[PDB]
């Protein structure tokens, strides 16, 4: 029983593949040998605890480095002219120009400038000194230690929970909606009201004076007497400076809307009310399902009773409760689908409605924070679709799902794949033809001959929000609508002042280039959805190979016969759609960074004239913003962007190195390693050294994964460098 011990079939492999696949089949717990239901769910539960401990031990070190090597107090004194320091650098390979050039933010040595928005976050939430961040780091060290204790505890046989506890979906949803989403957002509200609002108003509220510092002039009297408007009585004025007592109000739960006029960020009183609202509604929504007390819902009978009587949905959702509850890949795919749609809702709502103080002014931090959640969301959504494919191979029972909606997806799967194919082809011919046409017209000396389409649907939606720039004047931009008159005394005085401003990123002025790149975005989502729906629905089998389910999920191919069956598996469709999410989110974040990099220095006409054709994208965005990127180090000297100039070139290595695994395939390298094995076995003084693992080439799935991971690492490092060097070196 060698490594890997979870799979007996890989332990008898005498090659290097045994070393490789044991790393990659390490967390695929259900594919293990001598493996049961209880061990599956308990190992997944303790792996969740280890994941929670890693997240909290990560946050602890991102708090410890700000408290220890970062100037959080100096950034708190002046958040506009001080660069936030992540951590100090101890590199033995620096020369004296590198030590003298990485010393930023008034530090004593070479430090890294934090582009993660942790200073803006911790400032808005109430943390002011380094001692508060250190106490938070020790507290989250304790929390991660408690989660390690709980992870070890639930693997002990006294505290092992059974699968019936794990598959209790009603109790899990009630205690998740009530506890995880309700009492934590009500806990939050208690922080935002007790700590963050008085620290925005200058009052230092800590644990020593928690029971004495009253958050309102009349606290908990008007709450229980019903007059809640006392908590919205005296809001913060427009002369309020953040962190100071002057210009401040006393109301803890306002409904002002819009932005704080000095930080260009959301009001802590609004976010406190926001959390009291997504706390009351989640504790009320957490009393829905039936657990132990007679009242509630059984979701099995909800899904059984939700059948349309015309038969257009077949049996409806009958048999889907056992389908989700028995399949961990269905629950994980649903969780990652929801998580991608909310990690992208995170990205879309922290740039346009900045929630943290002095985050809108720090431009490259905002750029990093958008690109972060759009790449983490384009890998979470692809993981959702890949887990739908793994559900259809190793977890979907056609007998249990008989003529329900999930079986009817397989019944008309060629219609879904062909219509996603039509939509992708439509968007591709139209977007490419219009961009290439606008390229030809700028090439042929005639900018007026472009097909420029004003995006009047989304401009109509912006005028429906309150933008008076386009002059549609339908609702919330005209005073004759009932929605405006229902809102003009309640939230719209903040919202209209925030949306009619042209310096912020709240619902920006869009044009024909925005139309064209939104069809690029629709092309990217549609073609990624095409490959992923095609992988998920041809997961069990297809007309080329009907027994794809009996070959597992991530099998390489089926041989050169029947024309050729390369990339036939559903993992290979996931593999081909990782390139499409990289291209999609590359287009998304190209559009974001160029729409904002022209907004921040003022000349939005550069984007309005140049984004309609791809030579403007190549020249005015990829070439123009890379001026101080690749000049980070020269023969003459090196700048502070030099690490971002190396990380850019580094990306062009790793990405191109992926091509070595994605173009060249196995048997060339297998014969090459055969010649290498002969050469080592015949070389004098080196033949004495043996291998225990037989040297083989990388296997076919492993080759696609290694090329895909290299492609992804190079792709995220070329853009992390360019994006954090073409905004942080030319601020604006």
């Amino acid at each position: 029983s060698r490594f890997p011990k979870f799979s007996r079939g890989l332990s008898q492999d005498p090659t290097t593949r045994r070393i490789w696949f044991g790393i990659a089949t390490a967390h695929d717990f259900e594919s293990h040998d001598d493996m049961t239901e209880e061990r599956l769910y308990q190992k997944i539960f303790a792996s969740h605890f280890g994941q929670l401990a890693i997240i909290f031990l990560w946050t602890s070190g991102n708090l410890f480095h700000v408290a220890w090597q970062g100037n959080f107090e100096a950034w708190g004194q002046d958040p506009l002219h001080v660069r936030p320091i992540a951590h100090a650098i101890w590199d033995p390979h620096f020369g004296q120009p590198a030590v003298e050039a990485f010393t930023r933010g008034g530090a004593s040595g070479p430090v890294n400038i934090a582009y993660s928005g942790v200073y803006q976050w911790w400032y808005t939430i109430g943390l002011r000194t380094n001692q508060d961040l250190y106490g938070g780091s020790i507290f989250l060290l304790f929390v991660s230690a408690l989660f390690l204790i709980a992870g070890w505890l639930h693997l002990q046989p006294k505290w092992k929970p059974s699968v019936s506890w794990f598959k209790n979906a009603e109790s899990r949803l009630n205690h998740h909606l009530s506890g995880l989403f309700g009492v934590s957002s009500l806990a939050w509200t208690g922080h935002l009201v007790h700590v963050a609002i008085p620290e925005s108003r200058g009052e230092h509220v800590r644990w020593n004076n928690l029971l004495t510092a009253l958050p309102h002039p009349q606290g908990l009297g008007p709450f229980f007497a019903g007059q809640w408007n006392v908590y919205a009585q005296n809001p913060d004025s427009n002369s309020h400076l953040f962190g100071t007592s002057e210009g401040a109000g006393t109301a803890i739960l306002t409904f002002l809307g819009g932005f704080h006029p000095q930080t260009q960020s959301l009001w802590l009183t609004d976010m406190a009310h926001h959390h009291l609202a997504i706390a009351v509604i989640f504790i009320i929504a957490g009393h829905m399902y039936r657990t132990n007390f007679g009242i509630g819902h059984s979701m099995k009978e909800i899904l059984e009773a939700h059948t349309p009587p015309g038969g257009r949905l077949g049996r409806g959702h009958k048999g889907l409760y056992d389908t989700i509850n028995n399949s961990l890949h269905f629950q994980l795919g649903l969780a990652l689908a929801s998580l991608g749609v909310i990690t992208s809702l995170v990205a879309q709502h922290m740039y346009s409605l900045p929630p943290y103080a002095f985050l809108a002014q720090d431009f490259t931090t905002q750029a990093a924070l958008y690109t972060h959640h759009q790449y983490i969301a384009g890998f979470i959504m692809t993981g959702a679709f890949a887990h739908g494919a793994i559900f259809f191979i190793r977890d979907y029972n056609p007998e249990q799902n008989k003529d329900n909606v999930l079986a009817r997806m397989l019944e008309h799967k060629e219609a879904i794949i062909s219509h996603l194919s039509w939509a992708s082809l439509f968007l591709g011919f139209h977007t490419l033809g219009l961009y290439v046409h606008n390229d030809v017209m700028l090439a042929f000396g005639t900018p007026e001959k472009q097909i420029l389409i004003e995006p009047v649907f989304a401009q109509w939606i912006q005028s429906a929000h309150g933008k008076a720039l386009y002059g549609f004047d339908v609702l919330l931009s005209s005073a004759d609508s009932p929605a405006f008159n229902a809102g003009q005394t309640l939230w719209l005085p903040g919202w209209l002042d925030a949306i009619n401003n042209n310096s912020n990123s709240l619902f920006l002025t869009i044009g024909p280039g925005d139309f064209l790149v939104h069809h690029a975005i629709a092309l990217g989502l549609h073609t990624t959805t095409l490959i992923l729906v095609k992988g998920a629905l041809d997961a069990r089998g297809s007309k080329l190979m009907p027994d794809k389910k009996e070959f597992g999920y991530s099998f390489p191919c089926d041989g050169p016969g029947r024309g050729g069956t390369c990339d036939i598996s559903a993992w290979d469709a996931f593999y081909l759609a990782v390139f499409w999410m990289l291209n999609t989110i590359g287009w998304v974040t190209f559009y974001w960074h160029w729409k904002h990099i022209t907004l921040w220095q003022g000349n939005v006409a550069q984007f309005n004239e140049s984004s309609t054709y791809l030579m403007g994208w190549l020249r005015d965005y990829l070439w123009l913003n890379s001026s101080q990127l690749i000049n980070g180090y020269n023969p003459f000297g090196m700048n502070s962007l030099s690490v971002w100039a190396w990380m850019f070139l580094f990306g062009h290595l790793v990405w191109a190195t992926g091509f070595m695994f994605l173009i060249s395939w196995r048997g060339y390298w297998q014969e090459l390693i055969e010649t290498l094995a002969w050469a080592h076995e015949r070389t004098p003084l080196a033949n004495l050294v043996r291998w225990k693992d037989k040297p083989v080439a990388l296997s076919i799935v492993q080759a696609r994964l290694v090329g895909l991971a290299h492609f992804s690492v190079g792709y995220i490092f070329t853009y992390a460098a360019f994006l954090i060097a073409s905004t942080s070196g030319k601020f604006g």
């Binding site: 190992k43 303790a46 792996s47 605890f49 280890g50 401990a53 031990l57 602890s60 410890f64 408290a67 220890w68 107090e73 380094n130 001692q131 250190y134 780091s137 020790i138 060290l141 304790f142 991660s144 230690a145 390690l148 204790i149 992870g151 070890w152 693997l155 002990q156």
Partner: peptide, 30 residues
């Protein structure tokens, strides 16, 4: 700014956390 002795408190509490991470990894093995 934090002090010298507070770094000692953090390093012990991370080493205690590193033991509890080592204890879970032994139990995840078994």
């Amino acid at each position: 700014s934090i002090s010298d002795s507070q770094i000692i408190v953090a390093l012990v509490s991370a080493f205690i956390t590193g033991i509890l991470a080592l204890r879970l990894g032994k139990s995840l093995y078994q």
